Amino acid sequence: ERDCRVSSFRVKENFDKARFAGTWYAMAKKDPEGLFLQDNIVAEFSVDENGHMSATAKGRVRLLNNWDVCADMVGTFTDTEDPAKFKMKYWGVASFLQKGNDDHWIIDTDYETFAVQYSCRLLNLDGTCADSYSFVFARDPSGFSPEVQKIVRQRQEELCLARQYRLIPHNGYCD
Ligand SMILES: CC1=C(/C=C/C(C)=C/C=C/C(C)=C/CO)C(C)(C)CCC1
């Protein structure tokens, strides 16, 4: 009975790019297939005068070969018919880092305390997601209230990703 079709998923009402800007610490994540950011993940969102959203992000990634690096990533966002759904083109400062073009959906946020992001990289034939990732972001890296945790858990259920997230440390690795 829970609808896990990606096209069914609610996203943030009247999403406000400018209010979303600034520093977001990734507290928890659900991983996609393949190489991905591991931890010490901090994103910096910005919006220019014409409404164009972009971000930088830092995080540790371990290459296929056990080589740990601090990835310095860049993303530029293209707006769509839904103000909370973007296409994110991304690349690294280092040429060997992954480049791509991912959906970037703001599932929920209160702008001042938390955000839940989501990306489906591949649909199954039934419209559910075959390869997703999701970040839970915080403005404050010390933690969420129990009240905010409750809401985040709900959103995670709504994305059919409950119990699939891991907590992410911050330990200064990338500076
Ligand atoms: C750009 C960008 C994001 C995604 C980064 C990704 C997907 C990084 C992957 C790096 C890899 C796999 C490095 C190893 O080559 C998030 C969603 C955090 C929002 C802020 C801007």
Short mmCIF file of N, CA and C and ligand atoms in Angstrom, two decimals:
data_model
loop_
_atom_site.label_atom_id
_atom_site.label_comp_id
_atom_site.label_asym_id
_atom_site.label_seq_id
_atom_site.Cartn_x
_atom_site.Cartn_y
_atom_site.Cartn_z
N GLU A 1 0.81 -1.21 0.00
CA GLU A 1 0.00 0.00 0.00
C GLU A 1 0.85 1.27 0.00
N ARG A 2 2.03 1.31 0.65
CA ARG A 2 2.78 2.56 0.49
C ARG A 2 3.18 2.68 -0.99
N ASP A 3 2.93 3.84 -1.57
CA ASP A 3 3.31 4.16 -2.93
C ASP A 3 4.77 4.58 -2.96
N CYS A 4 5.61 3.79 -3.59
CA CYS A 4 7.02 4.10 -3.71
C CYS A 4 7.38 4.57 -5.10
N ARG A 5 6.40 4.88 -5.95
CA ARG A 5 6.72 5.47 -7.24
C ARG A 5 7.30 6.86 -7.07
N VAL A 6 8.43 7.12 -7.70
CA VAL A 6 9.13 8.40 -7.57
C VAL A 6 8.22 9.55 -7.96
N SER A 7 7.39 9.39 -9.01
CA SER A 7 6.50 10.46 -9.42
C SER A 7 5.43 10.78 -8.37
N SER A 8 5.24 9.93 -7.35
CA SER A 8 4.27 10.16 -6.30
C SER A 8 4.81 11.00 -5.14
N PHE A 9 6.13 11.14 -5.06
CA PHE A 9 6.78 11.69 -3.89
C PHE A 9 6.52 13.18 -3.79
N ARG A 10 6.12 13.56 -2.57
CA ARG A 10 5.93 14.97 -2.30
C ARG A 10 7.28 15.61 -2.09
N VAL A 11 7.31 16.88 -2.45
CA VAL A 11 8.48 17.72 -2.28
C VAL A 11 8.08 19.02 -1.60
N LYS A 12 9.05 19.87 -1.27
CA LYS A 12 8.79 21.07 -0.48
C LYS A 12 7.95 22.09 -1.21
N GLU A 13 6.82 22.46 -0.61
CA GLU A 13 5.90 23.49 -1.06
C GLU A 13 6.60 24.83 -1.18
N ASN A 14 6.50 25.52 -2.29
CA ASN A 14 6.95 26.89 -2.42
C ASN A 14 8.42 27.03 -2.02
N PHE A 15 9.21 26.05 -2.43
CA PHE A 15 10.63 26.06 -2.10
C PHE A 15 11.28 27.39 -2.47
N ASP A 16 12.04 27.92 -1.55
CA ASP A 16 12.67 29.23 -1.57
C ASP A 16 14.19 29.07 -1.66
N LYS A 17 14.73 29.15 -2.86
CA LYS A 17 16.15 28.96 -3.08
C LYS A 17 16.98 29.90 -2.20
N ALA A 18 16.60 31.18 -2.12
CA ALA A 18 17.43 32.14 -1.42
C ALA A 18 17.48 31.83 0.06
N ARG A 19 16.35 31.40 0.64
CA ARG A 19 16.35 31.06 2.06
C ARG A 19 17.15 29.79 2.34
N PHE A 20 17.29 28.93 1.34
CA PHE A 20 18.01 27.68 1.47
C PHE A 20 19.51 27.88 1.44
N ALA A 21 19.96 29.04 0.97
CA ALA A 21 21.39 29.22 0.79
C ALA A 21 22.16 29.12 2.11
N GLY A 22 23.47 28.94 1.99
CA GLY A 22 24.37 28.89 3.12
C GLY A 22 24.86 27.50 3.41
N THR A 23 25.26 27.27 4.65
CA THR A 23 25.95 26.05 5.03
C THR A 23 24.98 25.01 5.55
N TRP A 24 25.14 23.82 4.98
CA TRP A 24 24.35 22.66 5.38
C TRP A 24 25.32 21.51 5.69
N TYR A 25 25.23 20.96 6.89
CA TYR A 25 26.06 19.83 7.31
C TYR A 25 25.31 18.52 7.05
N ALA A 26 25.93 17.57 6.36
CA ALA A 26 25.22 16.25 6.13
C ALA A 26 25.41 15.33 7.32
N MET A 27 24.27 15.11 7.97
CA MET A 27 24.22 14.33 9.21
C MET A 27 24.12 12.84 8.99
N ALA A 28 23.32 12.50 7.97
CA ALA A 28 22.94 11.12 7.66
C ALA A 28 22.79 10.98 6.12
N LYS A 29 22.98 9.80 5.60
CA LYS A 29 22.85 9.59 4.17
C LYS A 29 22.40 8.17 3.88
N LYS A 30 21.77 8.05 2.74
CA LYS A 30 21.41 6.80 2.10
C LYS A 30 22.21 6.78 0.80
N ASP A 31 22.97 5.76 0.57
CA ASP A 31 23.90 5.65 -0.53
C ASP A 31 23.28 5.08 -1.79
N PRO A 32 23.79 5.56 -2.91
CA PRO A 32 23.48 4.95 -4.20
C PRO A 32 24.52 3.90 -4.50
N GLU A 33 24.41 3.30 -5.68
CA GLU A 33 25.44 2.40 -6.17
C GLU A 33 26.70 3.15 -6.55
N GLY A 34 27.84 2.48 -6.32
CA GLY A 34 29.11 3.00 -6.74
C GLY A 34 29.73 4.01 -5.81
N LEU A 35 30.68 4.77 -6.38
CA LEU A 35 31.45 5.69 -5.60
C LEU A 35 30.57 6.81 -5.08
N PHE A 36 30.77 7.19 -3.84
CA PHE A 36 29.95 8.24 -3.24
C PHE A 36 30.72 8.92 -2.13
N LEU A 37 30.29 10.11 -1.77
CA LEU A 37 30.86 10.79 -0.61
C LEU A 37 30.64 9.94 0.66
N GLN A 38 31.66 9.89 1.51
CA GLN A 38 31.60 9.02 2.68
C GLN A 38 31.26 9.76 3.96
N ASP A 39 32.01 10.82 4.27
CA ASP A 39 31.73 11.53 5.50
C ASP A 39 32.39 12.89 5.50
N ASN A 40 32.35 13.63 6.61
CA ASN A 40 32.84 15.01 6.62
C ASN A 40 32.22 15.82 5.47
N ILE A 41 30.94 15.60 5.24
CA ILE A 41 30.21 16.21 4.15
C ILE A 41 29.53 17.49 4.59
N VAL A 42 29.98 18.59 4.00
CA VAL A 42 29.43 19.91 4.22
C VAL A 42 29.18 20.59 2.88
N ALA A 43 27.98 21.09 2.67
CA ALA A 43 27.59 21.77 1.45
C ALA A 43 27.39 23.26 1.68
N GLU A 44 27.69 24.08 0.67
CA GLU A 44 27.54 25.51 0.71
C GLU A 44 26.73 25.91 -0.52
N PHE A 45 25.46 26.28 -0.27
CA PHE A 45 24.56 26.66 -1.34
C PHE A 45 24.56 28.17 -1.56
N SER A 46 24.42 28.60 -2.79
CA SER A 46 24.36 30.01 -3.11
C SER A 46 23.33 30.22 -4.23
N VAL A 47 22.82 31.44 -4.35
CA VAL A 47 21.82 31.81 -5.32
C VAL A 47 22.23 33.18 -5.84
N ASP A 48 22.36 33.30 -7.15
CA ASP A 48 22.76 34.63 -7.66
C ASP A 48 21.56 35.52 -7.91
N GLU A 49 21.84 36.70 -8.45
CA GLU A 49 20.84 37.73 -8.64
C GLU A 49 19.74 37.35 -9.60
N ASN A 50 20.03 36.42 -10.51
CA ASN A 50 18.98 35.97 -11.43
C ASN A 50 18.34 34.68 -10.95
N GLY A 51 18.56 34.24 -9.71
CA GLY A 51 17.89 33.08 -9.17
C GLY A 51 18.59 31.79 -9.44
N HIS A 52 19.80 31.84 -9.99
CA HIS A 52 20.51 30.60 -10.31
C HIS A 52 21.15 30.06 -9.04
N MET A 53 20.77 28.85 -8.68
CA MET A 53 21.32 28.16 -7.53
C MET A 53 22.54 27.32 -7.91
N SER A 54 23.54 27.32 -7.01
CA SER A 54 24.73 26.49 -7.18
C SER A 54 25.19 26.08 -5.79
N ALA A 55 26.15 25.17 -5.74
CA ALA A 55 26.68 24.76 -4.46
C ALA A 55 28.11 24.27 -4.66
N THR A 56 28.84 24.38 -3.55
CA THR A 56 30.08 23.65 -3.38
C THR A 56 29.87 22.61 -2.28
N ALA A 57 30.65 21.57 -2.28
CA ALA A 57 30.57 20.58 -1.22
C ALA A 57 31.96 19.95 -1.03
N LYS A 58 32.20 19.70 0.24
CA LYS A 58 33.41 18.99 0.64
C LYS A 58 32.99 17.67 1.23
N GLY A 59 33.76 16.62 1.06
CA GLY A 59 33.59 15.41 1.82
C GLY A 59 34.73 14.44 1.49
N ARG A 60 34.94 13.48 2.40
CA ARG A 60 35.93 12.44 2.16
C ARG A 60 35.35 11.40 1.24
N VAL A 61 36.17 10.94 0.30
CA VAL A 61 35.77 9.77 -0.50
C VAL A 61 36.97 8.84 -0.63
N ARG A 62 36.66 7.55 -0.62
CA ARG A 62 37.76 6.61 -0.70
C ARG A 62 37.71 6.02 -2.08
N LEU A 63 38.84 6.12 -2.78
CA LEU A 63 38.68 5.62 -4.16
C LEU A 63 38.68 4.11 -4.10
N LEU A 64 38.20 3.46 -5.14
CA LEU A 64 38.18 2.04 -5.45
C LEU A 64 39.41 1.26 -4.97
N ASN A 65 40.53 1.90 -4.83
CA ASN A 65 41.86 1.56 -4.44
C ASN A 65 42.28 1.93 -3.02
N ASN A 66 41.41 2.26 -2.10
CA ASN A 66 41.73 2.55 -0.70
C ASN A 66 42.32 3.93 -0.45
N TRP A 67 42.57 4.71 -1.47
CA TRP A 67 43.01 6.08 -1.47
C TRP A 67 41.94 7.04 -0.97
N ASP A 68 42.13 7.60 0.22
CA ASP A 68 41.21 8.58 0.78
C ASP A 68 41.54 9.97 0.26
N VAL A 69 40.57 10.71 -0.20
CA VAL A 69 40.79 12.07 -0.67
C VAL A 69 39.65 12.94 -0.15
N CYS A 70 39.95 14.21 -0.03
CA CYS A 70 38.91 15.18 0.22
C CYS A 70 38.43 15.71 -1.13
N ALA A 71 37.23 15.35 -1.47
CA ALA A 71 36.58 15.78 -2.69
C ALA A 71 36.05 17.19 -2.48
N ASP A 72 36.36 18.03 -3.43
CA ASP A 72 35.88 19.41 -3.47
C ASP A 72 34.99 19.46 -4.70
N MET A 73 33.72 19.48 -4.51
CA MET A 73 32.73 19.33 -5.56
C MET A 73 32.02 20.68 -5.81
N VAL A 74 31.53 20.74 -7.03
CA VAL A 74 30.74 21.91 -7.49
C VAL A 74 29.47 21.41 -8.16
N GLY A 75 28.34 22.05 -7.90
CA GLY A 75 27.08 21.72 -8.57
C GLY A 75 26.39 23.00 -9.02
N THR A 76 25.81 22.92 -10.20
CA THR A 76 24.97 23.99 -10.70
C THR A 76 23.59 23.40 -10.98
N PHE A 77 22.53 24.10 -10.58
CA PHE A 77 21.16 23.61 -10.59
C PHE A 77 20.32 24.32 -11.65
N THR A 78 19.58 23.52 -12.39
CA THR A 78 18.61 24.00 -13.35
C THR A 78 17.21 23.79 -12.81
N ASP A 79 16.45 24.89 -12.83
CA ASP A 79 15.10 24.90 -12.34
C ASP A 79 14.16 24.12 -13.27
N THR A 80 13.08 23.57 -12.72
CA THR A 80 12.09 22.85 -13.49
C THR A 80 10.70 23.39 -13.15
N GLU A 81 9.69 22.75 -13.69
CA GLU A 81 8.31 23.12 -13.45
C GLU A 81 7.94 22.99 -11.98
N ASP A 82 8.70 22.24 -11.19
CA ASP A 82 8.44 22.17 -9.77
C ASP A 82 9.53 22.92 -9.03
N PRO A 83 9.19 23.94 -8.26
CA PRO A 83 10.25 24.75 -7.62
C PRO A 83 11.18 24.00 -6.70
N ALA A 84 10.83 22.80 -6.25
CA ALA A 84 11.66 22.01 -5.39
C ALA A 84 12.43 20.91 -6.10
N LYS A 85 12.29 20.78 -7.41
CA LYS A 85 12.95 19.76 -8.20
C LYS A 85 13.92 20.41 -9.19
N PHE A 86 15.19 20.05 -9.08
CA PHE A 86 16.24 20.58 -9.94
C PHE A 86 16.96 19.45 -10.67
N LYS A 87 17.64 19.83 -11.74
CA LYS A 87 18.68 19.01 -12.29
C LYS A 87 20.04 19.60 -11.85
N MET A 88 20.91 18.80 -11.25
CA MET A 88 22.20 19.24 -10.74
C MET A 88 23.33 18.65 -11.59
N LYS A 89 24.01 19.52 -12.30
CA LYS A 89 25.24 19.17 -13.00
C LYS A 89 26.36 19.32 -11.97
N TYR A 90 27.24 18.34 -11.87
CA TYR A 90 28.27 18.41 -10.84
C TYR A 90 29.61 17.87 -11.35
N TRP A 91 30.67 18.33 -10.71
CA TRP A 91 32.03 17.95 -11.04
C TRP A 91 32.93 18.23 -9.85
N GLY A 92 34.18 17.78 -9.93
CA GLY A 92 35.12 18.08 -8.89
C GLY A 92 36.17 19.11 -9.31
N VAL A 93 36.77 19.74 -8.31
CA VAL A 93 37.94 20.57 -8.52
C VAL A 93 39.06 19.72 -9.11
N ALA A 94 39.22 18.49 -8.61
CA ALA A 94 40.19 17.53 -9.14
C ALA A 94 39.51 16.81 -10.30
N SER A 95 40.22 16.71 -11.42
CA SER A 95 39.68 16.18 -12.66
C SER A 95 39.30 14.70 -12.51
N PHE A 96 39.84 13.95 -11.57
CA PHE A 96 39.53 12.52 -11.47
C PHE A 96 38.25 12.23 -10.72
N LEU A 97 37.70 13.23 -10.01
CA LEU A 97 36.44 13.05 -9.29
C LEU A 97 35.27 12.88 -10.25
N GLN A 98 34.25 12.13 -9.83
CA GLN A 98 33.05 11.90 -10.60
C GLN A 98 32.37 13.17 -11.07
N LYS A 99 31.86 13.15 -12.28
CA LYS A 99 31.06 14.19 -12.85
C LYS A 99 29.75 13.56 -13.25
N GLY A 100 28.70 14.39 -13.25
CA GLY A 100 27.42 13.85 -13.66
C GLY A 100 26.32 14.88 -13.65
N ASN A 101 25.09 14.38 -13.79
CA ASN A 101 23.89 15.18 -13.87
C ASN A 101 22.80 14.43 -13.14
N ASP A 102 22.46 14.83 -11.94
CA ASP A 102 21.53 14.12 -11.09
C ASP A 102 20.28 14.95 -10.78
N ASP A 103 19.15 14.32 -10.70
CA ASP A 103 18.04 15.02 -10.04
C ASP A 103 18.47 15.46 -8.66
N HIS A 104 17.92 16.57 -8.23
CA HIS A 104 18.14 17.08 -6.89
C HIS A 104 16.83 17.64 -6.38
N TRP A 105 16.20 16.90 -5.46
CA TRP A 105 14.87 17.22 -5.00
C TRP A 105 14.95 17.63 -3.55
N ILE A 106 14.35 18.74 -3.17
CA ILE A 106 14.22 19.13 -1.73
C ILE A 106 12.90 18.57 -1.25
N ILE A 107 12.98 17.48 -0.51
CA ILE A 107 11.78 16.80 -0.03
C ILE A 107 11.08 17.58 1.05
N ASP A 108 11.87 18.09 1.99
CA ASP A 108 11.36 18.94 3.04
C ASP A 108 12.51 19.74 3.61
N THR A 109 12.14 20.87 4.21
CA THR A 109 13.08 21.69 4.92
C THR A 109 12.30 22.75 5.70
N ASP A 110 12.88 23.20 6.80
CA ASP A 110 12.36 24.36 7.49
C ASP A 110 13.33 25.53 7.34
N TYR A 111 14.37 25.54 6.70
CA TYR A 111 15.36 26.34 6.14
C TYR A 111 16.35 26.66 7.23
N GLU A 112 15.87 26.71 8.48
CA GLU A 112 16.71 27.10 9.61
C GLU A 112 17.24 25.96 10.44
N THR A 113 16.76 24.70 10.24
CA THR A 113 17.21 23.61 11.08
C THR A 113 17.55 22.35 10.31
N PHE A 114 16.71 21.91 9.38
CA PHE A 114 16.96 20.64 8.67
C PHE A 114 16.57 20.75 7.21
N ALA A 115 17.12 19.80 6.42
CA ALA A 115 16.62 19.53 5.09
C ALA A 115 16.73 18.06 4.78
N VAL A 116 15.79 17.56 3.99
CA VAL A 116 15.88 16.21 3.44
C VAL A 116 15.93 16.36 1.92
N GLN A 117 17.04 15.87 1.37
CA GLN A 117 17.24 15.87 -0.08
C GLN A 117 17.04 14.46 -0.63
N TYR A 118 16.82 14.36 -1.94
CA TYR A 118 16.66 13.06 -2.59
C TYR A 118 17.06 13.16 -4.05
N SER A 119 17.61 12.07 -4.56
CA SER A 119 17.91 11.89 -5.97
C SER A 119 17.65 10.46 -6.37
N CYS A 120 16.82 10.27 -7.39
CA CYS A 120 16.73 8.97 -8.04
C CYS A 120 17.50 9.02 -9.35
N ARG A 121 18.50 8.13 -9.45
CA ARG A 121 19.32 8.03 -10.63
C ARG A 121 18.84 7.03 -11.66
N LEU A 122 17.89 6.17 -11.31
CA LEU A 122 17.42 5.18 -12.26
C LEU A 122 16.03 4.72 -11.84
N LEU A 123 15.05 4.77 -12.74
CA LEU A 123 13.74 4.20 -12.43
C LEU A 123 13.68 2.73 -12.76
N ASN A 124 13.04 2.00 -11.85
CA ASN A 124 12.55 0.69 -12.27
C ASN A 124 11.39 0.83 -13.25
N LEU A 125 11.11 -0.25 -13.94
CA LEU A 125 10.00 -0.28 -14.88
C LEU A 125 8.67 0.00 -14.20
N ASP A 126 8.53 -0.27 -12.91
CA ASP A 126 7.29 0.06 -12.19
C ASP A 126 7.26 1.46 -11.62
N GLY A 127 8.27 2.29 -11.89
CA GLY A 127 8.26 3.67 -11.46
C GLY A 127 8.87 3.91 -10.10
N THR A 128 9.19 2.83 -9.38
CA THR A 128 9.96 2.96 -8.14
C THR A 128 11.41 3.25 -8.48
N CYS A 129 12.20 3.67 -7.51
CA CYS A 129 13.59 3.99 -7.81
C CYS A 129 14.48 2.78 -7.68
N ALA A 130 15.26 2.51 -8.71
CA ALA A 130 16.25 1.43 -8.66
C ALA A 130 17.60 1.84 -8.09
N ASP A 131 17.92 3.13 -8.00
CA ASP A 131 19.22 3.58 -7.52
C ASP A 131 19.04 5.00 -7.01
N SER A 132 18.97 5.17 -5.69
CA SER A 132 18.73 6.47 -5.11
C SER A 132 19.84 6.86 -4.15
N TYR A 133 19.88 8.17 -3.86
CA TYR A 133 20.64 8.63 -2.69
C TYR A 133 19.82 9.74 -2.02
N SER A 134 20.16 9.96 -0.74
CA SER A 134 19.43 10.96 0.04
C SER A 134 20.34 11.47 1.15
N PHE A 135 20.35 12.76 1.36
CA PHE A 135 21.00 13.38 2.49
C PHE A 135 19.99 13.98 3.46
N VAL A 136 20.27 13.83 4.74
CA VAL A 136 19.66 14.63 5.78
C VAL A 136 20.70 15.67 6.21
N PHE A 137 20.36 16.95 6.00
CA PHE A 137 21.21 18.08 6.31
C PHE A 137 20.72 18.84 7.56
N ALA A 138 21.67 19.43 8.26
CA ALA A 138 21.40 20.25 9.42
C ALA A 138 22.11 21.59 9.28
N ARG A 139 21.49 22.63 9.82
CA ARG A 139 22.20 23.90 9.91
C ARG A 139 23.25 23.87 11.02
N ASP A 140 22.95 23.09 12.04
CA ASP A 140 23.80 22.98 13.22
C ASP A 140 24.31 21.57 13.32
N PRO A 141 25.61 21.33 13.31
CA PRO A 141 26.09 19.93 13.31
C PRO A 141 26.03 19.26 14.67
N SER A 142 25.51 19.91 15.67
CA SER A 142 25.48 19.26 16.98
C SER A 142 24.28 18.35 17.06
N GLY A 143 23.36 18.39 16.08
CA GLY A 143 22.20 17.54 16.33
C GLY A 143 20.85 18.17 16.09
N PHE A 144 19.83 17.31 16.02
CA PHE A 144 18.44 17.68 15.93
C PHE A 144 17.67 17.46 17.20
N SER A 145 16.69 18.36 17.42
CA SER A 145 15.75 18.00 18.48
C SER A 145 14.99 16.73 18.17
N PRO A 146 14.43 16.13 19.23
CA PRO A 146 13.54 14.98 19.01
C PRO A 146 12.38 15.30 18.09
N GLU A 147 11.83 16.50 18.18
CA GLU A 147 10.75 16.99 17.37
C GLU A 147 11.13 16.98 15.89
N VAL A 148 12.31 17.47 15.54
CA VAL A 148 12.75 17.50 14.14
C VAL A 148 13.07 16.08 13.69
N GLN A 149 13.67 15.27 14.56
CA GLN A 149 13.91 13.87 14.20
C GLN A 149 12.66 13.11 13.77
N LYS A 150 11.56 13.39 14.46
CA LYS A 150 10.29 12.76 14.15
C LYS A 150 9.88 13.06 12.71
N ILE A 151 10.01 14.32 12.33
CA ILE A 151 9.61 14.75 11.00
C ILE A 151 10.53 14.14 9.92
N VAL A 152 11.83 14.19 10.17
CA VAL A 152 12.78 13.57 9.27
C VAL A 152 12.47 12.09 9.06
N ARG A 153 12.20 11.37 10.15
CA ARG A 153 11.87 9.95 10.00
C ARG A 153 10.67 9.73 9.10
N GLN A 154 9.64 10.59 9.31
CA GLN A 154 8.48 10.50 8.46
C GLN A 154 8.84 10.67 6.99
N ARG A 155 9.63 11.69 6.70
CA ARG A 155 9.97 11.96 5.29
C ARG A 155 10.72 10.77 4.68
N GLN A 156 11.59 10.17 5.48
CA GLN A 156 12.35 8.98 5.09
C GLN A 156 11.42 7.81 4.77
N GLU A 157 10.39 7.63 5.58
CA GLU A 157 9.36 6.64 5.24
C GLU A 157 8.66 6.95 3.89
N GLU A 158 8.34 8.21 3.70
CA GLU A 158 7.62 8.63 2.50
C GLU A 158 8.45 8.40 1.26
N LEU A 159 9.77 8.40 1.35
CA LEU A 159 10.64 8.15 0.23
C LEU A 159 10.95 6.66 0.06
N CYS A 160 10.33 5.82 0.87
CA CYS A 160 10.61 4.41 0.93
C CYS A 160 12.08 4.12 1.22
N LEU A 161 12.66 4.94 2.11
CA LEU A 161 14.05 4.80 2.46
C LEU A 161 14.24 4.64 3.97
N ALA A 162 13.16 4.44 4.71
CA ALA A 162 13.29 4.24 6.13
C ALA A 162 14.28 3.11 6.44
N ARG A 163 15.10 3.35 7.42
CA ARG A 163 16.02 2.34 7.96
C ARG A 163 17.16 2.09 7.00
N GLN A 164 17.27 2.93 5.97
CA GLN A 164 18.38 2.79 5.00
C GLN A 164 19.44 3.86 5.10
N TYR A 165 19.39 4.70 6.12
CA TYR A 165 20.34 5.76 6.30
C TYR A 165 21.39 5.38 7.34
N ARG A 166 22.56 5.97 7.23
CA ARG A 166 23.65 5.86 8.16
C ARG A 166 24.05 7.24 8.64
N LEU A 167 24.43 7.32 9.90
CA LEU A 167 24.94 8.56 10.45
C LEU A 167 26.34 8.83 9.90
N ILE A 168 26.64 10.08 9.65
CA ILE A 168 27.89 10.48 9.05
C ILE A 168 28.78 11.30 9.97
N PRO A 169 30.00 10.92 10.26
CA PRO A 169 30.80 11.77 11.17
C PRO A 169 31.41 12.98 10.48
N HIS A 170 31.76 13.89 11.36
CA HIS A 170 32.53 15.08 11.12
C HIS A 170 33.69 15.05 12.11
N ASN A 171 34.89 14.97 11.55
CA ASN A 171 36.08 14.86 12.38
C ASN A 171 37.27 15.64 11.85
N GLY A 172 36.98 16.63 10.99
CA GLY A 172 37.99 17.56 10.54
C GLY A 172 38.84 17.05 9.41
N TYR A 173 38.52 15.89 8.85
CA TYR A 173 39.38 15.28 7.83
C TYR A 173 39.63 16.19 6.62
N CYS A 174 38.63 16.98 6.27
CA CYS A 174 38.81 17.78 5.06
C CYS A 174 39.04 19.26 5.39
N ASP A 175 39.92 19.53 6.34
CA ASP A 175 40.72 20.78 6.50
C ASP A 175 41.47 20.74 7.82
C1 LIG B 1 27.70 18.49 -5.95
C2 LIG B 1 26.77 18.46 -4.78
C3 LIG B 1 26.23 17.29 -4.16
C4 LIG B 1 26.60 15.94 -4.59
C5 LIG B 1 27.85 15.45 -4.70
C6 LIG B 1 28.23 14.19 -5.21
C7 LIG B 1 27.19 13.21 -5.84
C8 LIG B 1 29.55 13.85 -5.11
C9 LIG B 1 30.21 12.73 -5.51
C10 LIG B 1 31.54 12.57 -5.53
C11 LIG B 1 32.27 11.45 -5.94
C12 LIG B 1 31.59 10.07 -6.21
C13 LIG B 1 33.68 11.50 -5.86
C14 LIG B 1 34.65 10.38 -6.22
O1 LIG B 1 34.99 10.52 -7.60
C15 LIG B 1 25.20 17.38 -3.03
C16 LIG B 1 23.99 16.47 -3.29
C17 LIG B 1 25.90 16.93 -1.76
C18 LIG B 1 24.66 18.81 -2.92
C19 LIG B 1 25.75 19.88 -2.90
C20 LIG B 1 26.46 19.84 -4.25
#
